[PDB]
Scaffold this active site. Structure first.
Site, PDB file in Angstrom:
ATOM      1  N   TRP A 130     -24.540  14.163 -18.065  1.00 35.03           N
ATOM      2  CA  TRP A 130     -24.535  14.628 -16.710  1.00 35.03           C
ATOM      3  C   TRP A 130     -22.896  15.115 -16.720  1.00 35.03           C
ATOM      4  O   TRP A 130     -22.140  14.067 -16.874  1.00 35.03           O
ATOM      5  CB  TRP A 130     -24.817  13.837 -15.742  1.00 35.03           C
ATOM      6  CG  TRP A 130     -24.632  14.375 -14.414  1.00 35.03           C
ATOM      7  CD1 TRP A 130     -25.341  15.223 -13.838  1.00 35.03           C
ATOM      8  CD2 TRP A 130     -24.115  13.435 -13.223  1.00 35.03           C
ATOM      9  NE1 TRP A 130     -25.262  15.289 -12.449  1.00 35.03           N
ATOM     10  CE2 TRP A 130     -24.375  14.222 -11.924  1.00 35.03           C
ATOM     11  CE3 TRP A 130     -23.456  12.362 -12.980  1.00 35.03           C
ATOM     12  CZ2 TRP A 130     -24.008  13.815 -10.840  1.00 35.03           C
ATOM     13  CZ3 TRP A 130     -22.880  11.839 -11.906  1.00 35.03           C
ATOM     14  CH2 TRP A 130     -23.171  12.792 -10.616  1.00 35.03           C
ATOM     15  N   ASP A 211     -26.537   3.797 -15.647  1.00 39.35           N
ATOM     16  CA  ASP A 211     -26.728   4.725 -14.468  1.00 39.35           C
ATOM     17  C   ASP A 211     -28.189   5.211 -14.414  1.00 39.35           C
ATOM     18  O   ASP A 211     -28.706   5.501 -15.364  1.00 39.35           O
ATOM     19  CB  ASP A 211     -25.967   6.160 -14.913  1.00 39.35           C
ATOM     20  CG  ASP A 211     -25.998   7.180 -13.925  1.00 39.35           C
ATOM     21  OD1 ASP A 211     -26.921   7.012 -12.889  1.00 39.35           O
ATOM     22  OD2 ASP A 211     -25.188   8.242 -13.831  1.00 39.35           O
ATOM     23  N   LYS A 246     -33.447  10.855  -5.937  1.00 39.43           N
ATOM     24  CA  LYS A 246     -34.754  11.695  -6.502  1.00 39.43           C
ATOM     25  C   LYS A 246     -36.148  10.761  -6.357  1.00 39.43           C
ATOM     26  O   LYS A 246     -37.011  11.295  -5.884  1.00 39.43           O
ATOM     27  CB  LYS A 246     -34.493  11.827  -8.047  1.00 39.43           C
ATOM     28  CG  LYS A 246     -33.283  12.874  -8.466  1.00 39.43           C
ATOM     29  CD  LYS A 246     -31.930  12.299  -8.826  1.00 39.43           C
ATOM     30  CE  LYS A 246     -30.860  13.116  -8.904  1.00 39.43           C
ATOM     31  NZ  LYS A 246     -30.088  12.641  -9.980  1.00 39.43           N
TER      32      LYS A 246
HETATM   33  C1  LIG Z   1     -28.533  12.575  -9.695  1.00 43.41           C
HETATM   34  C2  LIG Z   1     -27.669  11.849 -10.691  1.00 43.41           C
HETATM   35  C3  LIG Z   1     -26.659  10.997 -10.124  1.00 43.41           C
HETATM   36  C4  LIG Z   1     -26.248  11.277  -8.695  1.00 43.41           C
HETATM   37  O1  LIG Z   1     -27.052  10.485  -7.851  1.00 43.41           O
HETATM   38  P1  LIG Z   1     -26.742  10.969  -6.169  1.00 43.41           P
HETATM   39  O2  LIG Z   1     -27.647   9.952  -5.445  1.00 43.41           O
HETATM   40  O3  LIG Z   1     -26.883  12.394  -6.080  1.00 43.41           O
HETATM   41  O4  LIG Z   1     -25.217  10.597  -5.899  1.00 43.41           O
HETATM   42  C5  LIG Z   1     -25.904  10.325 -11.157  1.00 43.41           C
HETATM   43  N1  LIG Z   1     -26.345  10.109 -12.208  1.00 43.41           N
HETATM   44  C6  LIG Z   1     -27.293  10.796 -12.833  1.00 43.41           C
HETATM   45  C7  LIG Z   1     -27.506  10.764 -14.325  1.00 43.41           C
HETATM   46  C8  LIG Z   1     -28.042  11.778 -12.056  1.00 43.41           C
HETATM   47  O5  LIG Z   1     -29.106  12.422 -12.573  1.00 43.41           O
HETATM   48  O1  LIG Z   2     -28.731  18.266 -11.752  1.00 43.82           O
HETATM   49  C1  LIG Z   2     -28.444  17.295 -11.845  1.00 43.82           C
HETATM   50  O2  LIG Z   2     -27.992  16.694 -12.970  1.00 43.82           O
HETATM   51  C2  LIG Z   2     -28.437  16.217 -10.606  1.00 43.82           C
HETATM   52  C3  LIG Z   2     -28.367  17.215  -9.425  1.00 43.82           C
HETATM   53  C4  LIG Z   2     -27.372  16.396  -8.519  1.00 43.82           C
HETATM   54  C5  LIG Z   2     -25.870  16.541  -8.870  1.00 43.82           C
HETATM   55  O3  LIG Z   2     -25.740  17.080 -10.187  1.00 43.82           O
HETATM   56  O4  LIG Z   2     -25.120  15.784  -8.291  1.00 43.82           O
END
Ligand SMILES: *Cc1c(COP(=O)(O)O)cnc(C)c1O
Ligand SMILES: O=C(O)CCCC(=O)O
Ligand SMILES: *Cc1c(COP(=O)(O)O)cnc(C)c1O
Ligand SMILES: O=C(O)CCCC(=O)O
Lengths: 396, 396
Positions: A130, A211, A246
């Site tokens: 990410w 994570d 999510k």
């Molecule tokens: C979505 C996501 C986050 C962020 O979480 P939030 O609740 O949107 O801040 C962190 N790490 C990964 C890998 C994610 O997919």
């Molecule tokens: O698309 C993603 O990898 C998560 C959406 C939320 C974000 O990026 O903060």
């Protein structure tokens, strides 16, 4: 002051939202941000969540501050999801959890905690990962290194390269692992591989940092926690940040947690006091609504039953969608064989397109995806599947 | 990693909550944290807020991400509260607002913004001030200096000392000002003094940073904004962080804003992009519930009418309470004359007790206040006023 300030580059994922609002072409297909969509292409609030909100409305008497670490009941519940009912960590009181603003907030607090209270200088992030990971750790002052993970050629986990590259990680280094549904590859280690990483980790002296943003999207709540749990049974200390954006569909309510695990209760308490100090200097205390909703659901057997079925439904819609996606692609006479998509866990499709191909997709077709060639499968509906596949075939 | 970690010292204000939970003596009087209490000694959720939540429950269709800066309508509404309906700042599009997690979150983001995008090295904080100020700026890496403000002897604003000490502030330095209801003194500058500070500020080259946490608690919404507005009419750039925790009673929902003001729209946009980048690296996007409630109220004339009357009620209860407090003190034969309490704005009583006196108050009487001798007048009810005053007299 602000005369020489440079314009910050748009976020690679979040920047898609801005672009979309300026594009007035009707048939736009949004496959960027990783949010769930139902058969109609809408991201709705779960029925279980609506009911919990009703309860809150009727029984909430005050909105007084929550306490630096948040709602106690919520922390207890998250620990059981992650570690399990009769976990030794829970029973030996070696874990302390802090309610944070989403999974990002959790990563930020752990980073500030690490940066100022330990000798940690660097964090190892998978390649790819990410995008916001590097940013979060770098802003905290930590150096970010990368380890091999994906195999673009075979679309699998290059375990040998992973291990071989991680051998460069010195003791006292943080190694970030995605609990499940690896963003963006969708490839996760096998339980056997998780145990290998677990033993290697303890032997090398790494500080694990998990994570967890998609627990329940790969196979199920418990099944998805196997990797962390294999690490928990052998490690004295570890950190885990999770999100409920999510799996509960509470994206904008910012619900997540940062958990600290130490050898014993006194060490974890001493360490946790510094984490609270880092929070007090950031946002003071966390937002109650979202976590209250999560505590209410998990705590009430009926609401929990409805919620779990909703999670099962979502996962099931994505699994069917990626199969239908590959099937429709062949019918459109797609050049390449994308069957590997079915092996990926989560909401994403990764490894099929190039940067230029995604550019042409938005430019000429109004199909929006992330520049790395990652598409949100959860954004595909029976209605858009056809024109979407046509767009892809014309770009292959 | 966590073996040598030291226990962080408890927060001077928030630490009172922990202490209270361990003290099982029935007649405990909580006058610590600055939260409002009604005649029954309860901090309730406003009727206007409950109604807005009802609306949200019924008309909310998704919980999808909000966008780094949050709810647009909310930013627009906050700008009018601060700058005014036909403000030149609003009309020249020189201001940009970001929804943040409470007023603390706003201070944190402005600090990160400043630290990394400007040459700012130090911030000037009043003596005394809310304790968390120094902590927020220091954690961001900024040096914190202090300027004279209070006159313990006369219980007034030592304007000469203020100016004389601020002459040590070099151009490019940030000077933090409390919009109104100065925490903890309750002494604010006169409009005449605000204009003097405004002219001095521009002439010296300071970057104003206003902390607005009690707008509406001194005299009224608009009246309380006079100081900022006097600064806004003469300054090119300024930053303002506000909170809605107190005036909306939404403490745990973490509602606040950070506003940037530059010479023009292009500069503010360029600067604002960096503020968004600092947010993305902290919590990503803000919590929707609280701000949604604030947007719903302010945007609907009926709800706004009810809310304003609720704010007027709260202020009125505190004003009557401090008068009744001074009156009851004389009846108990209190040693010192505390009439200056009536000149203070806000929820607090400051300047009457010493550290040892407050220690004895909790030790022997179960009355909890902040170690600096600051008592939350909004926590006084007709029921507890008597035994409270008795406790104070026995300590004088
Ligand atoms: C979505 C996501 C986050 C962020 O979480 P939030 O609740 O949107 O801040 C962190 N790490 C990964 C890998 C994610 O997919
Ligand atoms: O698309 C993603 O990898 C998560 C959406 C939320 C974000 O990026 O903060
Ligand atoms: C309450 C307060 C804050 C904090 O605002 P939150 O909304 O609680 O984060 C900031 N500054 C001052 C002076 C305050 O009184
Ligand atoms: O300290 C806080 O975070 C909230 C209470 C404000 C005060 O008592 O000054």
């Amino acid at each position: 002051m602000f005369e020489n300030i440079t314009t910050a580059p748009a976020d690679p994922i979040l920047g898609l939202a801005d672009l979309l609002r300026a594009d007035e072409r009707p048939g736009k297909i949004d496959l960027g941000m990783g949010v769930y969509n139902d058969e109609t292409g809408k991201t709705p609030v779960l029925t279980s969540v609506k009911k919990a909100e009703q309860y809150l409305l009727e029984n909430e008497t005050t909105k007084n501050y929550l306490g630096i670490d948040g709602i106690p009941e919520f922390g207890r519940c998250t620990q059981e999801l992650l570690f399990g009912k009769g976990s030794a960590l829970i029973n030996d009181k070696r874990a302390r959890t802090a309610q944070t603003p989403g999974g990002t907030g959790a990563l930020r607090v752990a980073a500030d905690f690490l940066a100022k209270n330990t000798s940690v200088r660097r964090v190892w992030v998978s390649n790819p990962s990410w995008p916001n990971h590097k940013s979060v750790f770098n802003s905290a002052g930590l150096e970010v290194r990368e380890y091999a993970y994906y195999d673009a050629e075979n679309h699998t986990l290059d375990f040998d390269a992973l291990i071989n590259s991680l051998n460069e990680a010195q003791a006292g280094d943080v190694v970030l692992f995605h609990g499940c549904c690896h963003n963006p590859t969708g490839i996760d280690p096998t339980l056997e591989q998780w145990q290998t990483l677990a033993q290697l980790s303890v032997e090398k002296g790494w500080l694990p940092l998990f994570d967890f943003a998609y627990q329940g999207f790969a196979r199920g709540l418990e099944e998805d926690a196997e990797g962390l749990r294999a690490f928990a049974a052998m490690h004295k200390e570890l950190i885990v940040a999770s999100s409920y954006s999510k799996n509960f569909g509470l994206y904008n309510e910012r619900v997540g947690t940062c958990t600290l695990v130490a050898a014993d209760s006194e060490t974890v308490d001493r360490a946790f006091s510094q984490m609270k100090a880092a929070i007090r200097v950031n946002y003071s205390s966390p937002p109650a609504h979202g976590a209250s909703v999560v505590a209410t659901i998990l705590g009430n057997d009926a609401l929990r039953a409805i919620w779990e079925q909703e999670l099962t439904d979502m996962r099931q819609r994505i699994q069917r969608m990626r199969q239908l996606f590959v099937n429709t692609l062949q019918e459109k006479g797609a050049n390449r064989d994308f069957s590997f998509t079915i092996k990926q866990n989560g909401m994403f499709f990764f490894g099929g397109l190039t940067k230029e191909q995604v550019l042409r997709l938005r430019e000429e077709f109004g199909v929006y995806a992330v520049a790395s060639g990652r598409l949100n499968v959860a954004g595909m509906t029976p209605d858009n599947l056809a024109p979407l596949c046509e767009a892809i075939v014309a770009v292959l």
